[PDB]
Design a protein around this ligand. Structure first.
Ligand SMILES: CCCCCC/C=C/CCCCCCCC(=O)O[C@H](COC(=O)CCCCCCCCCCC/C=C/CCCCCCCC)COP(=O)(O)OCC[N+](C)(C)C
Ligand SMILES: CCCCCC/C=C/CCCCCCCC(=O)O[C@H](COC(=O)CCCCCCCCCCC/C=C\CCCCCCCC)COP(=O)(O)OCC[N+](C)(C)C
Ligand SMILES: CCCCCC/C=C\CCCCCCCC(=O)O[C@H](COC(=O)CCCCCCCCCCC/C=C/CCCCCCCC)COP(=O)(O)OCC[N+](C)(C)C
Ligand SMILES: CCCCCC/C=C\CCCCCCCC(=O)O[C@H](COC(=O)CCCCCCCCCCC/C=C\CCCCCCCC)COP(=O)(O)OCC[N+](C)(C)C
Ligand SMILES: CCCCCC/C=C\CCCCCCCC(=O)O[C@H](COC(=O)CCCCCCCCCCC/C=C\CCCCCCCC)COP(=O)(O)OCC[N+](C)(C)C
Ligand SMILES: CCCCCC/C=C\CCCCCCCC(=O)O[C@H](COC(=O)CCCCCCCCCCC/C=C\CCCCCCCC)COP(=O)(O)OCC[N+](C)(C)C
Ligand SMILES: CCCCCC/C=C\CCCCCCCC(=O)O[C@H](COC(=O)CCCCCCCCCCC/C=C\CCCCCCCC)COP(=O)(O)OCC[N+](C)(C)C
Ligand SMILES: CCCCCC/C=C\CCCCCCCC(=O)O[C@H](COC(=O)CCCCCCCCCCC/C=C\CCCCCCCC)COP(=O)(O)OCC[N+](C)(C)C
Ligand SMILES: CCCCCC/C=C\CCCCCCCC(=O)O[C@H](COC(=O)CCCCCCCCCCC/C=C\CCCCCCCC)COP(=O)(O)OCC[N+](C)(C)C
Ligand code: NA
Length: 644
């Protein structure tokens, strides 16, 4: 009377008037609502999911009934819990369905019987949009309700009579509720609204509940926290909100990262928490994540917030400026040292090994210092291949290209030294390409000034969305005419004189004469040796119009369309270049020296409810406001000033 297909029409239909009869039929035959001849063969779906999917205006009258019949045969902690055993909805239960349908009345019901509030929806659907899934809320019903802008259940699953969902529970990746809100978040307006609210709501609620380590400290199975997870994923709206977290109620002020050290009239000093941002060596940091392994589309907005920008300038003036300007002079000299050898490198015989003088020993000092630079830039770039390297190289204006070019320069100094030692005499030609790269690799060191650093990246953008497009067509106009005009010149079999005639290098030299014409440093050198002389000049004049008057001047005009558009991008890319420069210098120091150039200070920011004073390494920011007069919230230092 009640087989599989007939019921799943009923509970789908929502008619609680023909299923009066399951009990006398589901008791004498000794069946159960959780059998294999009663669930769909593919997923594992049951009456109780099917009801909530087929929900009539927020009300399916069958769920109060089926669980009554479930009890009188007997199952609640096996019926409600029954997960879909698919590889695609794995772990999903009726409760995961009761909240996504946004039905609160039954979440009370499903929890009233004590179903589960930590079942983990591990399916390929319940997977981020980086694996082959759609919607990753975490994996828990609590993490779901928070990640769907549904506060009242997020309260309920915490504050209810029956079994409570704690916030400390990790999903299969370590990610708690707050790790998950950073995952579902985007940097839109309405998303960042409830993300921050439900973010706030919980770590406040974690403190009134378990009075211990904040939930925001709970790392995951990658090693990251919600703040370091926002930095890696590019979530500004929450990333901002964490760093400027002012909590006023003194029971939870310890969940703050912006403080108010003092406020005399309309001037106050704000004091930021650099607990994770600037950790000198020991811990993983927010600042090394934004700058190295993050999303380049939003780093400039994540580095252009509270203390980060002030924090990098506070590193540049200490050590970042100086050490950089020792890196530049040491490189320029190394290229002087590499210049002098090539100018005093002899050019007779086998590769000129014999030195036998003082000057030739001074040259040898230049070749040994040189080969060091090559192998140095070799090893430093190969260890980078095992460590930081491999973004979208050479379309990446944050040392993506220069890493590639110093690697080339590293090869050619090793090749040239191989051939200079293997006896081949073309050490020079390879060495000559190395020399020119290296002086062009001194554009690397234009980061110490917004002027020249903004300059060396426009060069690289006007070399992409600009003069390669030109090289394309210009090679079509040029091969077209170069083949067309040499087709008119008569061979030298006809007889010895090239510049009138055609033989065997005509094309080659003639391209150069056409390359000179477009740019202007050539002469037409009009020729009567051709068989049709008038048609020849019809074609040169079209080359000169369609290449100097039309393209090479349009080439100037496209740059103007570029440098007006990529200027704002270029100021933002420099701030990454500049920052990546600092953290590389800093990272190269030992920990005791980083810990000597700390950007901050210990401050007694409050008591940790045990009398333990909270000694956080922090960063001051003087600020002024002639409108926010009631600055009487968190005045740590009642005596305003720093009183040095
Ligand atoms: C940029 C190019 C990319 C595609 C590859 C195109 C290659 C172009 C080079 C053309 C070489 C010349 C070959 C034809 C002419 C020639 O030489 O003909 C002959 C025979 O040739 C040779 O014996 C070989 C000599 C050259 C070898 C080294 C080239 C190395 C080029 C490397 C590529 C350049 C970029 C490298 C950087 C890569 C990374 C960048 C980032 C990429 C983005 C990530 C004459 O020679 P000769 O020695 O005089 O022989 C004597 C013959 N006799 C007279 C005695 C009978
Ligand atoms: C204190 C605030 C000062 C503010 C005022 C301004 C001061 C500026 C001083 C600048 C110092 C840095 C410049 C020196 C050269 C330098 O650092 O060259 C670096 C590397 O050099 C070293 O490895 C040498 C080891 C020793 C260095 C420090 C010596 C200075 C110490 C004295 C300063 C004062 C503090 C401590 C002294 C100890 C006692 C405790 C203090 C507290 C009181 C007792 C060059 O970079 P490179 O690796 O080539 O680039 C990275 C390459 N990559 C990763 C990008 C590929
Ligand atoms: C990925 C990097 C690795 C590169 C791969 C290529 C490496 C090695 C090739 C060298 C071996 C070939 C020569 C051996 C045979 C020989 O000996 O051949 C010679 C002539 O050979 C040459 O001239 C070889 C020219 C080499 C240059 C290649 C390109 C180098 C790299 C190019 C890329 C970098 C660009 C920079 C430019 C800046 C602009 C853009 C910047 C970027 C944009 C801003 C024959 O004459 P002969 O006197 O008889 O020789 C002596 C022979 N004897 C009599 C002793 C037996
Ligand atoms: C291998 C031996 C090398 C020996 C040392 C050679 C010289 C090193 C320079 C380091 C000393 C300090 C001067 C540079 C710092 C500076 O002024 O950086 C910039 C401006 O810089 C320049 O326009 C230097 C243009 C080129 C310089 C020569 C390089 C070689 C080129 C030839 C801004 O100031 P900054 O300190 O960063 O700001 C904070 C300072 N604030 C306000 C706290 C006092
Ligand atoms: C108050 C501060 C007290 C400290 C004072 C200074 C102390 C020590 C100075 C030590 C000098 C050597 C430091 C080397 C640092 C270094 O390794 O630099 C490298 C640069 O390559 C080299 O150096 C090549 C290696 C061979 C050495 C140089 C040539 C031989 C020695 C010359 C020394 C003489 C100097 C100058 C004489 C002329 C003077 C005119 C003044 C004028 C003042 C205006 C940093 O490249 P990287 O960051 O890794 O970026 C590369 C790109 N990539 C890989 C990251 C993408
Ligand atoms: C990812 C970047 C691209 C990969 C590297 C591309 C390498 C290009 C250069 C290839 C060699 C061109 C000239 C032919 C060899 C030659 O002419 O001489 C060869 C010299 O061989 C080289 O130096 C090959 C170095 C290859 C790896 C790059 C350097 C290291 C970096 C590795 C790449 C990363 C010597 O034997 P030979 O002279 O014919 O006879 C004399 C025999 N004796 C006296 C030496 C015993
Ligand atoms: C390759 C490595 C990289 C090197 C980098 C350092 C290079 C240069 C140092 C420049 C420092 C100042 C730059 C700040 C400019 C600025 O801030 O503002 C600029 C104003 O520009 C200037 O005034 C440029 C200088 C004018 C005089 C030229 C020579 C000065 C250098 C020293 C002398 C060199 C000569 C002769 C040598 C003779 C010696 C005997 C040998 C002779 C033979 C024996 C525009 O204002 P704004 O629009 O507001 O800027 C926007 C950026 N903003 C404000 C946000 C930072
Ligand atoms: C996907 C396309 C792939 C196609 C590639 C095919 C290229 C070449 C293979 C064929 C050449 C074989 C060698 C020729 C024979 C030879 O050895 O001839 C030599 C002379 O030297 C040449 O002729 C070689 C220079 C070029 C010649 C024209 C071809 C032009 C090729 C241009 C390729 C264009 C690519 C791309 C377009 C640009 C835009 C970017 C793309 C799209 C986006 C990426 C011997 O002369 P001699 O005996 O003295 O003759 C005298 C005869 N007399 C006096 C008796 C009548
Ligand atoms: C859209 C661009 C392409 C247009 C192409 C179509 C136009 C013309 C091509 C056909 C020309 C044919 C010429 C005649 C054939 C020839 O060559 O006959 C030669 C001699 O010729 C002549 O005496 C012709 C007199 C001069 C007038 C030339 C044409 C008119 C010139 C103005 C052209 C204006 C338009 C265009 C140019 C500006 C372009 C920039 C725009 C933008 C581009 C996108 C044969 O020698 P022979 O009689 O044996 O020697 C003389 C007799 N004696 C004394 C030895 C016995
Ligand atoms: Na213009």
């Amino acid at each position: 009377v009640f087989n599989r297909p007939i019921l799943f029409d009923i509970v789908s239909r929502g008619s609680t008037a023909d299923l009066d009869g399951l009990l006398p039929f589901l008791l004498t035959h000794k069946k159960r609502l959780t059998d294999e001849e009663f669930r769909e063969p593919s997923t594992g779906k049951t009456c109780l999911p099917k009801a909530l999917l087929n929900l009539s205006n927020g009300r399916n009258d069958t769920i109060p009934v089926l669980l009554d019949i479930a009890e009188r045969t007997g199952n609640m902690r096996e019926f409600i819990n029954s997960p879909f055993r698919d590889i695609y909805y794995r772990g999903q239960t009726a409760l995961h369905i009761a909240i996504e349908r946004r039905c609160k009345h039954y979440v009370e019901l499903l929890v009233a019987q004590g179903a589960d509030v930590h079942a983990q929806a591990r399916g390929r659907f319940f997977q981020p949009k980086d694996e082959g899934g759609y919607f990753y809320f975490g994996e828990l019903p609590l993490s779901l309700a928070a990640c769907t802008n549904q506060p009242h259940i997020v309260n309920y699953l915490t504050e209810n009579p029956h079994k409570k969902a704690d916030m400390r529970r990790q999903d299969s990746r370590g990610n708690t509720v707050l790790h998950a809100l950073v995952a579902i978040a985007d940097n839109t307006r309405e998303n960042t609204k409830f993300v921050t609210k439900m973010y706030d709501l919980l770590l406040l609620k974690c403190a009134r509940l378990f009075p211990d380590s904040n939930l925001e400290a709970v790392l995951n199975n990658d090693g990251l926290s919600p703040l370091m997870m926002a930095a890696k994923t590019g979530k500004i709206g929450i990333f901002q909100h964490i760093i400027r977290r002012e909590v006023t109620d003194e029971d939870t002020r310890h969940l703050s990262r912006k403080f108010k050290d003092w406020a005399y009239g309309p001037v106050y000093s704000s004091l930021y928490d650099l607990s994770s941002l600037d950790t000198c060596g020991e811990e993983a940091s927010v600042l090394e994540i934004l700058v190295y392994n993050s999303k380049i589309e939003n780093r400039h907005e994540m580095l252009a917030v509270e203390p980060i920008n002030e924090l990098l300038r506070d590193k540049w003036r200490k050590f970042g400026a100086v050490s950089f300007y020792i890196n530049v002079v040491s490189y320029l000299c190394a290229m002087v040292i590499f210049t002098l050898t090539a100018y005093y490198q002899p050019l007779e015989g086998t590769p000129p090994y014999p030195y036998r003088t003082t000057v030739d020993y001074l040259r040898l000092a230049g070749e040994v210092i040189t080969l060091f630079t090559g192998v140095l830039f070799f090893f430093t770039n190969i260890k980078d291949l095992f460590m930081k390297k491999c973004p979208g190289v050479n379309s990446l204006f944050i040392d993506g290209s220069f890493q590639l070019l110093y690697f080339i320069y590293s090869v050619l100094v090793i090749v040239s030294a191989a051939l200079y030692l293997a006896g081949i005499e073309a050490y020079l030609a390879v060495m000559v390409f190395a020399l020119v790269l290296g002086w062009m690799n001194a554009l690397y060191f234009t980061r110490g000034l917004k002027l020249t650093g903004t300059y060396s990246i426009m060069i690289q953008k006007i070399l992409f969305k600009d003069l390669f497009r030109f090289l394309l067509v210009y090679l079509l106009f040029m091969i077209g005419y170069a083949s067309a005009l040499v087709s008119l010149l008569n061979p030298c079999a006809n007889v010895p004189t090239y510049p009138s005639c055609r033989d065997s290098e005509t094309f080659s030299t003639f391209l150069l004469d056409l390359f000179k014409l477009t740019i202007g440093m050539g002469d037409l050198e009009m020729l009567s040796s051709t068989k049709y002389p008038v048609v020849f000049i019809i074609l040169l004049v079209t080359y000169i119009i369609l290449t100097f008057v039309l393209l090479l001047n349009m080439l100037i005009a496209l740059m103007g369309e570029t440098v007006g558009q990529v200027s704002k991008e270029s100021k933002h890319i420099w701030k990454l270049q500049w920052a990546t420069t600092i953290l590389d210098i800093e990272r190269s120091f030992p920990v005791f020296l980083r810990k000597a150039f700390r950007s901050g200070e210990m401050v007694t920011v409050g008591k940790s409810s045990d009398g333990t004073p909270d000694r956080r390494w922090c960063f001051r920011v003087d600020e002024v406001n002639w409108s926010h007069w009631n600055q009487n919230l968190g005045i740590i230092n009642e005596d305003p000033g720093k009183n040095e």
